[PDB]
Structures are given as structure tokens and as C-alpha cells.
Amino acid sequence: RPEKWVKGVCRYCGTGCGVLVGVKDGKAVAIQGDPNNHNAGLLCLKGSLLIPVLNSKERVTQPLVRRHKGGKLEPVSWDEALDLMASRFRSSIDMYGPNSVAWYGSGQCLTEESYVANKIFKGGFGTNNVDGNPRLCMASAVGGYVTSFGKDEPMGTYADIDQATCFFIIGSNTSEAHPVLFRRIARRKQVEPGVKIIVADPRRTNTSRIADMHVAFRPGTDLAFMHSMAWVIINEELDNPRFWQRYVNFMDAEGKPSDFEGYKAFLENYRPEKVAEICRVPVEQIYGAARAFAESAATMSLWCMGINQRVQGVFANNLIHNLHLITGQICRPGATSFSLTGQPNACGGVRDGGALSHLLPAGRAIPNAKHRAEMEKLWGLPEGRIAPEPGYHTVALFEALGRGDVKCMIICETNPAHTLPNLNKVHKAMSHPESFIVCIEAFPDAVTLEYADLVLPPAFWCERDGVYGCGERRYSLTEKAVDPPGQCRPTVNTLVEFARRAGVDPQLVNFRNAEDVWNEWRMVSKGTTYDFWGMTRERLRKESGLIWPCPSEDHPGTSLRYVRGQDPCVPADHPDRFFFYGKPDGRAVIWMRPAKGAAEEPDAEYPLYLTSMRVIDHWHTATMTGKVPELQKANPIAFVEINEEDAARTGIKHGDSVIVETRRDAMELPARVSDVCRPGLIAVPFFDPKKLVNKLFLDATDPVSREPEYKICAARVRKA
Ligand SMILES: Nc1nc2c(c(=O)[nH]1)N[C@H]1C(S)=C(S)[C@@H](COP(=O)(O)OP(=O)(O)OC[C@H]3O[C@@H](n4cnc5c(=O)[nH]c(N)nc54)[C@H](O)[C@@H]3O)O[C@H]1N2
Ligand SMILES: Nc1nc2c(c(=O)[nH]1)N[C@H]1C(S)=C(S)[C@@H](COP(=O)(O)OP(=O)(O)OC[C@H]3O[C@@H](n4cnc5c(=O)[nH]c(N)nc54)[C@H](O)[C@@H]3O)O[C@H]1N2
Ligand code: SF4
Ligand SMILES: [Mo]
């Protein structure tokens, strides 16, 4: 069938598999893994069933306007839509200042789209109200990397998986969430049976079936668990003083300078016999995990939402880094502290791109007066155009919309009416009778469209070209494989036309296409520790991704950051083999963060922990994977997981309709009684739009990253 294969990237998870899209007579007919990208030709079942999604007729294909709140969506021309969008936004700024408008985007947006949007808002409008769904996700890992190393993003790559001799896998259901990486992990243990795997997660998932040890600790007690591991490492003389004496600093519980002796004193509060009882685990798991971690030749940690979606998320990230820093299990092949990124482009588009409320592109910060001046110079802005104040972070943004402080919002390639925490609160904010909400959305069944005043039809996935930056610092091009249907337009172009019409200086949006923007972005990264100047559109066309830092066309890219001879940001003649250059003295920092718990812990009235999780067949809100019949055959609808020994004790059996109730709402769900959830925990998925589980969850956030605690709240269950 296919006459040609078009190279791109899988639409789904931050594993970032390359994809070849097979096309015949302008239509996509087949898909295979890119043999030259890291996945080496392999896709999971989601990746492999992308053609039905791309070919679906169930698409937003024309602009729609709701003339009045509560009205119905009706057809409207592109020009009328762009004029309406431009005049409302312009008028808002004219009347109330830039802070009355906001961008709410996505880690699924092309890097180029998020770049243009971020520039329009911060540089054109003069507001820093640019945030996005990675606030819900990766913000705690950013905080953890910036506080430990002074720079965002992993220092290792997926390649370290192939030399790791121990895996510490915490708050990650890698099997269901990163299937191609899970297979690479399983394969490593297959090829070297000596490889040790620790899986640390209150639920027993498919990820545990390759583990030497499954640590089913009590929700929120993992900080005490990880401090206790460090206590064992030091107590049994398994630390690395040649490393930490030269390359580490110590900060105490107050965030003040300290030392190794201070660290040991602090760790006395986390002895294994005490912590085992806090965590509800056998004491031998603490010793066993610590010893596996520190005795192994090369140890790699991997983690995702169970660690990040936490009011102690930044701190929990810090503790993982602590373990690597005290042992020097870092900056060597196989040995690294690796945050897993959930979305295909949270890394490239939002974090690296600085498309969050407090950031500027390529490692710059809003509160830094010098970073503002650098961006005004790079972007051709008048002096002081960039507001000194961070804009609203996602949770505060929707609160601001609720108050009427934010009057005009663009929502793009994300579905916040389904996925924000505390939905009953959120749905009210999104119903402000004087709000103007514009949605750029590919599928009509996204529940957010029920709040939209204006809906614009986007080009989907490989209907246009653009870069995705996955979890390992790999930036990969998707070339255009097919035309968009109907009146669908590339969002890069829509954003440019919107800005022009809203009175933005045309010098600020001088872009015909995504390649034009990519070239300006390259220049804005030049000289920074992100420098990807060497990633020309032409190299990205021929390559299956390049890994930053990559400062010139003759540069291969970078696998080991902070390492002399590997990282071009480390001077060739630096006195030391390693250089944590994001800190002013080149040293990484161990943080003695106190272990606490969730914002909403169980009590007499709500005695269970409630968590939320993923499932392999379904992608987030299922507006895409929902179009694939094969993906509906195992878990067609939501359920609640309940512990066996909990349920029997409370007269609940498998299949029973149960009421799950928090302080915020109550929902009926079929009971899925087993040993997956440890005792005292229940668990709901969020893929089902008929069961908006975020109505049950609380909005409490990490006070630094502002990531919501989706992983923990308090609940009760009773038979319906
Ligand atoms: N199939 C599929 N894959 C995906 C996605 C999808 O929608 N579908 N989405 C992608 C995105 S954007 C992301 S963020 C990743 C998410 O990937 P994961 O975070 O790996 O998946 P979750 O099920 O949300 O992960 C939560 C795991 O953390 C656990 N957890 C709960 N409480 C705690 C705690 O107190 N401590 C610890 N340490 N763990 C806890 C839960 O038991 C759960 O099994 O998946 C990505 N991959
Ligand atoms: N309870 C609970 N809630 C959670 C989580 C959890 O673990 N538990 N996880 C959180 C995390 S980590 C994340 S990443 C978020 C993700 O949450 P969302 O981002 O809200 O979920 P998605 O379904 O990925 O949203 C992508 C949207 O883009 C649309 N779309 C697809 N292609 C295109 C395109 O080209 N253009 C446009 N405009 N739209 C397109 C899809 O139809 C869909 O509505 O959810 C968060 N919510
Ligand atoms: S592991 Fe992730 S990126 Fe790879 S094919 Fe599966 S969904 Fe796509
Ligand atoms: Mo995510």
C-alpha cells in the first residue's frame, strides 16, 4: 500500500518513539516504528493504532461560535472568528491591562506553537499569564532539578537503561505509562539477570512483575522511606565521600548550609525500624532497597506522577537526587537520576521553551531583570515590555477566571474541564457569565468545549510539521504526512494571524510556518546551557532526533550533562571531571527536606486514601484513543480499585456498585476488588468522561512547583 513513509514522532507518551507514517494517494494507511530513533522500530499498541485516530471523521473541521452563554455552538467563518478573538482580547487589554488575558496550553503542542503563544502573550501583550498542563505534571520535577542541580531536565538519557545494574522505580507505573521504556528495562534484566529492580508504589502494578522487591508503602510516606534508605547507606558505609566531598553541598531542614555530619544527625530521625512502621512495610525492604541502590555498579532511578503530583513533590524529587549524590551514582553510563516525563512535549515545548507563568525561554526567569532585558533584546521589544511579575499558575489562573480577573482565555490542546483538580470548583470558574473562552480543539467530544465561546479547528498531529521534545532531551521532527481536513489550520499560522489582528507588532510574529519559528527559537537558545543552535531543520529532517546541548552543525548532541569531555557547557580544560554549572560553585545540593504527608490525610470520617492513575489502553481524556475500538476491549469504563482485605472486612464484593465519596463529591463506580491497592488505599482512573473523578480530588498544591496533589486525598466507600 504505502508509496512513501513520512518520519515523525508518536502522538502519545514522553517515551517519544519515532514513527514512520505510510501514505498512499494523500492518505495515511500504515504506521511503523522509526528504526533510527531510540525505540529502534518498536511501538506499543497505542502508537501502533494511530492511523484510525488520524483518519477519524469525528473532528472539529470548522470554526464555531457560541453567541451567548448557555447557547449552542454554531458555524462561523474563519475571518469572523479571528476578528472576534482579536477584538475581545484587544479590548480587554485596552480596558483592564494585559493581566486580564491568559494562555492555557499544553505539553502536546508543537514546540513552535507554544513558542509563538508564549511570545505573543509575554512580548506582545505584556502579560506573563502563560501556563499549561505541565503544571499538573512535571512542575515538581523542574523544582527538584533546579534546586538540586540549578538546571532543569535529566542529566542522563534512555541509553543509561542499558548499563544500569540497579533500577529504583518510584511513583511510576512504567508498564502502562511508558511501555517502550518498560520493555527496555525488562530486556536489561533479561540480558543481565544480575540486574536488581526495586518498584516503590502503594499499588501492585504490572511494573512490579519484573521487580526483585515491591515496596507497597502507605501513600505519602515515601519521603520518610527515602530518608531511611540514606540512613542505611551512611550507616553501612556505602556512601561515596570522594564524590560528595568534592561535588556536593548540604542544606539542613531550614534550607541553611550544613555538612555531612549535619546530614547524619538529621537522618537519625529516619531509622529503618521507625520508618517501616510509618510506611507500613517490612523493615527489611528499607535495608534491601538501600543496599541494592548503593552496592550496585550503576544505579538509575526513574519516577513519575506518584512522586510529582504531591504537595511535597519538589521535596520528594530532592530525596531521590539525595540518594544519587551521596553515592555518586551519577554522571556515569547506567548511573543517573531520571525523571520520566509524561507528555510528548512537556520538555521541549513548555519547560525548555519557558512557556510557564514564571519562566522565559531557554533557562531564563521572569523575576530576573537581566533575563528580561536579554529577551527584550532578542525579541526586539521596547524596554520594560516584559512584566517583572510571574503570571497566574494553572490553579490560580482558573481561580482568576472565576473571579473575573482573567476575562479572556485561550485553551489549546488540553481538556481542563475534565483534567483539572477540584472540578466542581473549576466548572464554576469556567462558567463566569462574562468570560470569553477560546478553544483550539481537534475533537468535538472534549468536555471543555461545553464552556467554549469560540472553537477553532486545528491541523492534527502529522497534518503539519513541528518539533516534540521528549523525556531524554531528544528533539525530533514530525514532517507533514497528509493534508488537514475541512478548514483545519496549523496553529502556528492561526496564532500569527490572531496576533496581527489583535494589534501585535508584526515584527514579533514574522513567521510563515513552523520552520521559521524553529530558527528564531534556535537563536534564542544560543549561548545558554540549552543551546540547540546546531539542530537545523535539515539535520532534524534526516536525523531521528538530536539530544541537547547541541551548539553547532558538526556537534553530535549530548548524552552526559555536567561531564567534562561529553557536555560542551563544561569547559574542555575545567579542573574537575564533573561540573554542576547550574550552581555558582559547581556543586550539587543534598536537601534535608522534612517528611510530612498529604494536604488531605484520612481521618475517622474519611478513613481511606484515594489515588488516581493511568491504564495502558487509554490516553488521558480518551478523545483520541476513544476512536480506536481495539483500545476499548479491556477497560471500557471507569471502576474503583479496592483492597481485598479492606473489602471483605466491609462487606464489599467484586462487581458491586459502590459510592466513592470525598468532602467534595460522591460518585457511583463498579468495585474492582483485589490486591493491587495496598490496605487503606482505593484508586480511580480518569479516562471516562461519564465519571469525572477530578470532582472528588482536592486542589492543594506544592507551594513551590504549584503542582496539584492528584495522587492523594481522603475518601470513604459504601455499597450503593
Ligand atoms: N497509557 C497511557 N500512558 C501515559 C498517559 C496516558 O494517559 N495513558 N499519560 C502520560 C502522562 S502525561 C504522564 S504524566 C505519565 C504518568 O505516568 P505514571 O505516573 O507512571 O502513571 P500514574 O498511574 O498516574 O502513576 C501513578 C503511580 O503512582 C502511584 N502513587 C500513588 N500514591 C503514591 C505515593 O504516595 N507515592 C508514590 N511514590 N507513588 C504513588 C500510583 O499507585 C500509580 O500506580 O503517563 C504518560 N503515559
Ligand atoms: N485525577 C487525575 N487527574 C489528572 C492526572 C492524574 O494523574 N490524575 N494527570 C494530570 C496530567 S499529568 C496531565 S498531563 C493532564 C493531561 O490532561 P489533558 O491535557 O486535559 O488531557 P488530554 O486528553 O491529553 O488533552 C489533549 C486535548 O487535545 C485535543 N487534541 C488532540 N490533538 C490536537 C491538536 O492538534 N490541536 C488541538 N487544539 N487539540 C488537540 C484532544 O482532543 C484533547 O481534548 O491531566 C492531569 N489530570
Ligand atoms: S511507548 Fe509512548 S511514545 Fe512509544 S509508541 Fe507507546 S505511546 Fe507512543
Ligand atoms: Mo502528565
Whether the CB of 210 sits within 6 Å of ligand 2: no
- In this structure, the residue with its CA closest to atom 2 of ligand 3 is 13
Q: Which of 85, 109, 138, 713 is catalytic?
A: 138
Residue 596 forms part of a structural domain: no
Closest ligand, as measured to the CA of 181: 3
CB 510 within 8 A of CB 516: yes
Whether the CB of 172 sits within 6 Å of ligand 2: no
Q: Tell me: is residue 278 an annotated ligand-binding position.
A: no
Which pairs from 667-672 meet CB under 8 Å and 24+ separation?
667/691, 667/693, 667/695, 667/696, 668/720, 669/638, 669/639, 669/640, 670/637, 670/639, 670/640, 671/639, 671/640, 671/642, 671/647, 672/639, 672/640, 672/641, 672/642
Residue 490 forms part of a structural domain: yes
Cα(16) to ligand 3 centroid in Å equals 6
Q: Tell me: is residue 528 an annotated ligand-binding position.
A: no
Residue 674 forms part of a structural domain: yes
Rounded Cα distance between 581 and 572, Å, is 14
Could you give the angle at which helices 222-235 and 272-279 cross, rounded to 10 degrees?
160
CB 282 within 8 A of CB 317: no
Please classify residue 518 by burial: count the beta carbons closer than 10 Å to its beta carbon, then call 0-12 exposed, 13-18 middle and 19+ buried: buried
Q: Which of 166, 226, 304, 305 is catalytic?
A: 305
Same domain, 617 and 706: yes
Same domain, 460 and 316: no
Three-state DSSP at 411 gives: strand
Please classify residue 594 by burial: count the beta carbons closer than 10 Å to its beta carbon, then call 0-12 exposed, 13-18 middle and 19+ buried: middle
Residue 598 forms part of a structural domain: no
Q: Which residues line ligand 1 (CB under 6 A)?
A: 13, 137, 170-173, 176-177, 200-203, 205, 219-220, 222, 304-307, 342-343, 611, 613-614, 616, 618-620, 711-712
What grid cell was written down for 267? 537522618
Same domain, 192 and 335: yes
Tally of CB atoms within 10 A around 41: 13
For 154, 211, 347, the CA distances from 170, given in Å and listed in that order, are 16, 12, 20
Residue 602 forms part of a structural domain: no
CB 334 within 8 A of CB 192: no
In single-letter form, the type of residue at position 395 comes to V
Residue 433 forms part of a structural domain: yes
Same domain, 286 and 349: no
Rounded Cα distance between 628 and 618, Å, is 10
Same domain, 575 and 643: no
Same domain, 426 and 510: yes
85 is catalytic: no
Q: What is the CATH number of the domain that holds 611?
A: 2.40.40.20
Same domain, 348 and 299: no
107 is catalytic: no
For residue 80, give the H/E element and its range. helix 78-96
Half-sphere exposure of 279 (CA within 13 A, CB side): 29
Closest residue by Cα to residue 714 from 645, 644, 663: 663
155 is catalytic: no
Alpha helices for 272-431 (secondary structure H): 272-279, 283-295, 305-308, 313-327, 369-379, 394-403, 416-419, 423-429
Same domain, 131 and 150: no
- β 588-591/248-251 pair status: parallel
Atom of ligand 3 lying closest to residue 19 CA: 5
Q: Tell me: is residue 677 an annotated ligand-binding position.
A: no
Closest ligand, as measured to the CA of 42: 3
Resolution of the model in angstroms:
2.2
Residue 123 forms part of a structural domain: yes
Rounded Cα distance between 366 and 354, Å, is 10
CB 110 within 8 A of CB 345: yes
Rounded Cα distance between 562 and 602, Å, is 42
Rounded Cα distance between 598 and 80, Å, is 48
What grid cell was written down for 34? 522509526
**Angle of CA points 91, 132, 710, to nearest 5°:** 130
Please classify residue 95 by burial: count the beta carbons closer than 10 Å to its beta carbon, then call 0-12 exposed, 13-18 middle and 19+ buried: exposed
Closest ligand, as measured to the CA of 19: 3
What grid cell was written down for 323? 540518594
Place of cell 496564532: 495
Calculate the CA dihedral of residues 118, 120, 121, 126 and round it to 10 degrees: 130
Give the N- to C-terminal CA distance of the chain in Å, as an integer.
53
Three-state DSSP at 28 gives: strand
Closest residue by Cα to residue 490 from 454, 463, 524: 463
Closest residue by Cα to residue 199 from 180, 212, 182, 189: 212
Buried residues in 464-484 as b, exposed as e (16+ CB within 10 A): bbbbbbbbbbbbbbbebbbeb
Same domain, 488 and 459: yes
What grid cell was written down for 204? 501492585
Residue 149 forms part of a structural domain: yes
Q: What is the CATH number of the domain that holds 318?
A: 3.40.228.10
Rounded Cα distance between 568 and 557, Å, is 9
Q: Tell me: is residue 643 an annotated ligand-binding position.
A: no
CB 426 within 8 A of CB 416: yes
CB 166 within 8 A of CB 299: yes
Q: What is the CATH number of the domain that holds 418?
A: 3.40.50.740
Phi, psi at 66, each rounded to 5°: -100, 105
Three-state DSSP at 396 gives: helix
For 158, 658, 716, the CA distances from 650, given in Å and listed in that order, are 45, 12, 11
Rounded Cα distance between 294 and 231, Å, is 12
Alpha helices for 130-247 (secondary structure H): 139-149, 174-177, 179-191, 222-235, 241-247
CB 128 within 8 A of CB 391: yes
Q: How many domains does the chain have?
A: 4
CB 323 within 8 A of CB 168: yes
Tally of CB atoms within 10 A around 486: 11
Rounded Cα distance between 350 and 654, Å, is 42
Cα(516) to ligand 1 centroid in Å equals 36
342 is catalytic: yes
Same domain, 220 and 299: yes
Domain span at residue 303 reads 137-342+560-591
CB 111 within 8 A of CB 349: yes
Q: Which of 22, 33, 46, 109 is catalytic?
A: 46
Please classify residue 409 by burial: count the beta carbons closer than 10 Å to its beta carbon, then call 0-12 exposed, 13-18 middle and 19+ buried: buried
If you ran DSSP here, which 8-state letter would residue 442 be given? Answer: S
If you ran DSSP here, which 8-state letter would residue 551 be given? Answer: -
Same domain, 450 and 385: yes
In single-letter form, the type of residue at position 254 comes to E
Rounded Cα distance between 465 and 493, Å, is 12
Elucidation method: X-ray
CB 328 within 8 A of CB 577: no
Whether the CB of 694 sits within 6 Å of ligand 2: yes
Same domain, 110 and 41: no
